[PDB]
From Swiss-Prot, chain B:
The name this protein goes by in its record: Major capsid protein
Species in which this protein is naturally found: Paramecium bursaria Chlorella virus 1
One cellular component term from this protein's GO annotations in UniProt: viral capsid
Lineage of producing organism: Viruses, Varidnaviria, Bamfordvirae, Nucleocytoviricota, Megaviricetes
Transmembrane annotation, as ranges: none
Taxonomic superkingdom: Viruses
GO molecular function: lipid binding; structural molecule activity
Family: Belongs to the NCLDV major capsid protein family.
From Swiss-Prot, chain I:
Superkingdom, taxonomy of origin: Viruses
Protein name: Minor capsid protein P2
Subcellular location: Virion
Native species: Paramecium bursaria Chlorella virus 1 (PBCV-1)
Task performed by this protein: One of the minor capsid proteins that constitute a network internal to the major capsid proteins and outside the lipid membrane. The minor capsid proteins glue and stabilize the capsomers. Also acts as a molecular tape measure protein that determines the size of the viral capsid.
Subunit structure: Interacts with the major capsid protein.
Induction data: Expressed in the early-late phase of the viral replicative cycle.
Domain remarks in the Swiss-Prot or TrEMBL record: The hydrophobic region might anchor the protein in the underlying inner membrane.
Amino acid sequence: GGLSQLVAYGAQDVYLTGNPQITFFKTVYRRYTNFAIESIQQTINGSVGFGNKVSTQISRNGDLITDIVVEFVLTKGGNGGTTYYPAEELLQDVELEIGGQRIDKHYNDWFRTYDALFRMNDDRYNYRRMTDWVNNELVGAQKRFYVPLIFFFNQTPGLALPLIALQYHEVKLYFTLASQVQGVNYNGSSAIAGAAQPTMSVWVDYIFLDTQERTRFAQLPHEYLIEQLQFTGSETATPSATTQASQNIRLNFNHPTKYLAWNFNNPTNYGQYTALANIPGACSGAGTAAATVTTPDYGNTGTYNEQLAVLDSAKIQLNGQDRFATRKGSYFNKVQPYQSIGGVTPAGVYLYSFALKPAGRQPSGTCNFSRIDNATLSLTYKTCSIDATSPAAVLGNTETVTANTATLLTALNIYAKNYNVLRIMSGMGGLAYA
Amino acid sequence: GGLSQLVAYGAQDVYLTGNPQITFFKTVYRRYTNFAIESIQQTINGSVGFGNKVSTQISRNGDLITDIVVEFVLTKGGNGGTTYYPAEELLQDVELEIGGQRIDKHYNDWFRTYDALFRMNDDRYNYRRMTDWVNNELVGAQKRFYVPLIFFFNQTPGLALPLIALQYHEVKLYFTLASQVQGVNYNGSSAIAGAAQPTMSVWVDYIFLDTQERTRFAQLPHEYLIEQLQFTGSETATPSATTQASQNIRLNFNHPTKYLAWNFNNPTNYGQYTALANIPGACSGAGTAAATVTTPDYGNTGTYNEQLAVLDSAKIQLNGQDRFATRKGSYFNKVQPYQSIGGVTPAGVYLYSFALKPAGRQPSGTCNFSRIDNATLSLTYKTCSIDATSPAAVLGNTETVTANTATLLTALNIYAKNYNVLRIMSGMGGLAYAN
Amino acid sequence: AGGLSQLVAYGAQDVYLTGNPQITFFKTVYRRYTNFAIESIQQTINGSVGFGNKVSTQISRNGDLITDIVVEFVLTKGGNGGTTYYPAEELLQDVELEIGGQRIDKHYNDWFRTYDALFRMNDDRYNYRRMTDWVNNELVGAQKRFYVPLIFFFNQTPGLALPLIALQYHEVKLYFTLASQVQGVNYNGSSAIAGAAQPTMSVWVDYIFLDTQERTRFAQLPHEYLIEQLQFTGSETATPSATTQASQNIRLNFNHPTKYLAWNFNNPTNYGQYTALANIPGACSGAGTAAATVTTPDYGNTGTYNEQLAVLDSAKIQLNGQDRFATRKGSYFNKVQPYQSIGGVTPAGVYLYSFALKPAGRQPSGTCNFSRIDNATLSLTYKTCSIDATSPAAVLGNTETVTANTATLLTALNIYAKNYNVLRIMSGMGGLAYAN
Amino acid sequence: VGFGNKVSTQISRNGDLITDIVVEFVLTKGGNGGTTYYPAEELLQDVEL
Amino acid sequence: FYVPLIFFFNQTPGLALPLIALQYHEVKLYFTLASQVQGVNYNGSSAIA
Amino acid sequence: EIGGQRIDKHYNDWFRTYDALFRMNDDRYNYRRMTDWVNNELVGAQKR
Amino acid sequence: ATSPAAVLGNTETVTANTATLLTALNIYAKNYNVLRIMSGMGGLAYAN
Amino acid sequence: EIGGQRIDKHYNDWFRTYDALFRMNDDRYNYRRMTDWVNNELVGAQKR
Amino acid sequence: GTTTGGKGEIQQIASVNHNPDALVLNYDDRPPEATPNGAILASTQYGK
């Protein structure tokens, strides 16, 4: 039996088993500080509705705050497949603020971009389950949705905000609700008569500590290594024919940065990052005589066919000096996510990392834009010459061209995910470098 | 090139690259105690068959025990789409005993819940591959199945069970094999004539140790962090019209608890936790004129549409006091496994964790029910008013209602996973706490 | 009420959990690291790139450390939907890693298919597919750029990064053999596709630049890297059509502390086919229709999970004539072992037995060192190939010990061993610590 | 403020001691006489202090 | 409408809440408003348009 | 109010009194511009 | 553009209708740097 | 490129702008002789 | 030429002359200051 391979021992094992340090079959577990977690509803300021703004004033029920989940109730006004993350579209943005100082700012498109890059198949589908209509539901169906927030301390107990030691600050969440949400009160740009206004609550998970730790957190200074999101939107010039247009995007970022990610979207259809085409799942009615390439088959808005992607190539240039040789667009869509995350990114979302493992919390390499005078992102676009209604061309053309419908993806969303430090000093909090 | 970033550092880097402590690009590996893994068959005592009890003793053919796999050979008695994890429903009752002292006890429904709740991605797909027919197979097909056990020492070598340290306390595995298997012995409740009895074999994976460590394991006392499953069955009574039920089911659990999880099942069928309805995946013949919502399209029994579930909201109370605010069923089906597991929990399976990492082994938060006299899980139910045969109402209704066929989910199964401490000394061992 | 009550409910069972706390979860201390920059640089490919050609590239010592390397191919389809199956992977017939004139490792297209088939998971396995195949039912004429990452010891973790700076006196090279026959691009079965274009290839190498303090350490200090190697030879099978279940006792010639053995039963006519063809969905070209032919796969679905199309009934490993473990059935090595040791799903026809607790991991976790073993064999028992592949009634409706008549085409036996060795670097020159 | 909504208030610390608390609602009747029964507290589904 | 609350300090002054002595706490009330209130927005189970 | 203590209160018909009394020509007109329709706007006109 | 009478007979501020085809703008600068070589290695002194 | 470092980079259009600006007389003509068909060569003509 | 393999790119000078560190206000240039939290103090000074 197994004794035969123990006998098969030799000099080569000196690097494996000779003079050992560890054993694999007797784990020593560490004793942890006693804690308990509650989940309570918060006090939500403002009138809830489409296009309205509301805010949350974080209660001091506990010692640390970690997971924040925003809860909606929506009624669908369309048929099956007319929606695409309506709970995520509704949450147009959220700002997190401590004592008047902005700590972070997220957008609906960022949540979509984050899910496109860093979430994986099971947690991405479960996300879809709590944010979208995933069981072929019909018109009139009512479903409760959850949009977990992803601030630096969310899903990260190690960076939980020390509320016990923020007794000199407001901690607030500022939410903007969307004026149009696809399939529940608008179908494309057309209002849905009789649509119901949403019901909203922000649910917060509080961590309660024991006697000794509450003292430690309340009295001692702390240094929290945190994440931030930097953003501004811009327009693009997508080429029609006979040309592959270039665009020089001026980057406007200021902190050690772990990665740059971007997408190109049609602002009228939330989450559409690719061209529409008369192929399965690529547009409304695709494959039938009723097919149109002006409107997506919303529930199948995300795809993986990069021929419907607008980006031909890109490079990051720092102070006029190219940071690496030009890559074609599929590099940023399929390879960096493989190297840096280990998951699949749908077509239309691009990632380049400065970090070995940007998905982790331990810093693994950053780009400090505060010491770079002129950083740009150079974009080359695919020629939009394919007739979107002819599968013969859409599924059978060259790598440098895309559909004529790609000219609608005129908005660029450029994100920088960075690091900062949150300092807690005598009960007061704010950023080390703001 | 990259040198443009290498040199471009400043004040904001002192907490990232200042006075470096680690390097990412030179790793050092720790050397281990030489060992070997071997998988051998145990002697099986008893008559193997449906409804029969069988026992085996783990022979002292090694030093530490890690995984255990129970082998079945089954012949399918129905046509395609008539089975739903036959191998694990057959493995009805698995009891782990050391020296006459019960250590743990698992049920077939827990195996289904664990697979539904804590396994993920390819792990649970392969689990199904080892336990069901997944390639449209036909009646008469023979397939070999493997049901891995998930006891405390089965999921990681770090808690391997040291038989070398238990030379006086026999370690035994008791099995009950289900009297009914869906798609093998019965089509629904109708017996399948000529169905074959199973062939069963229990395989145990042994670890052989090096001399110096083997000696220490035999002579030194040991303590292991051991996980247990607590269970008892409950009953519910979900209403069909005008009313919604509220139950307060006392939680008769007694040790540090990692999480509580529960489901609602139809006792007739195995693994069914949602209503049947004339829609894809919830009805035999779904969508056709012959669609019958008495029984599912068994091969697709699990679904994700929570409006086929009966649980509207729940809260846990400890000492008659709320433990957290009342949340809707979708919170326990979708939000809690998202935060704690990162997987996909099918409709009808619910989780509330006390731990940051309930799927992990390192303790990370527990509710110690040994110091709580009264606790109860409060369950608020949906009204089962939708006509299951009309997709217009099944796929197009309000949050608080479900299908009339949902009332068949009359069995309530509440599980608790907890910690104990396994004490082994001088060849004898058993649990540390008993409550 | 709430969690406050839960904290009060403290008792005897907690002394092993929360008594005398050693750690907390809510005050994580992160480590400060050595300053570096990552740059991905294009390499020059020496030689004419094409079908059936051998080309090579020398890695320019532009940076200090090397980690991932991605081979980029530009291919056009010679067929329509479903006519390809990892066309980028079968083209990358093999890659030889050479450091200073001596071989460190060599990977084969079939190995890349095995590594993909059993180690990485649905999420990145699909992206891997996206990077290697056409997955959107693309038609003839479609052009796509493919990325085939290499999986050498230095690219599965930065901790094993190859320090070119410490290898100052010699070159590191990659030799690439490009397959002459690529299904759906240059050939369709045995038939050449007229007008098929030659591939264009580029090899992207990812460099790391180090700062002054660590760059010096790497240049001056010796290094000992504990690294992985692949060992491989091919053989042939004895797969009967009737009256018997054949056995083979195949002698292994492997020579280092080995983490695992994995094996395929291949049909060399096609790429990645490890199961029989049958007139059931996804199991042959035209499956389910009157035009179904079970001599040719519906290539894009070449991989399946139906064990009845596999040929292995049971297998055992013997070392110096003694059983290493008791004979196991084929499904054990296809499903139970990767379940136990990897945590993913292995398609039918691909089998693995581990000696390691965590063979997908980098740290050693149990090995069988075949350098101290003389007679190490893999005993393989075959299923009898008596089922008529064109009749679903039997293909989907027969016993464990029989398979499809088309199963006899899996005539090539591919056994891989993954092992440890040590790569030592002293005075600007590198080499392996153990020979053979 | 509305049907199915959850609202809260902290007590404005104007005084020293608090005694009674009275919640006002303004409602529009959806039917004729005899169609209501304690609608003001029916609406006040709960209060947690 | 007026809905007086009936907590321990609401009906008699001798139990008045001494906020002045609780300068390190907030005192707050959560008010849950029913989604269905008979005769103002539903008549039985039927919504009142 | 500050801390719950009332500091001041303004009324309709005070704003008109202040505007009609302390604001002067351009600044009173510009104020009107901010609060009224001063360009003979017709039914349906929308202003901020 | 098709009528020489206009192409060869007009004002400073006008050009041909076909000028709208000149859609791409290419601006080039010629600059100094310092190329340093020492003990077998070489590179530019300044990156910017 | 020298040692992995870019030293300079030129485009086809720069080559023409450079010729358009800095070469003068018959050097531009000889240049064109090297780069163009300057003798009314016809279809099929082969030139170095 | 000694380059059988190569030697890594020489470090070159990349100075900061524009103001990319602008808008970055640290805890030292300005420290955080208190605002109200959940615990509120009563209107302590009611006037005379």
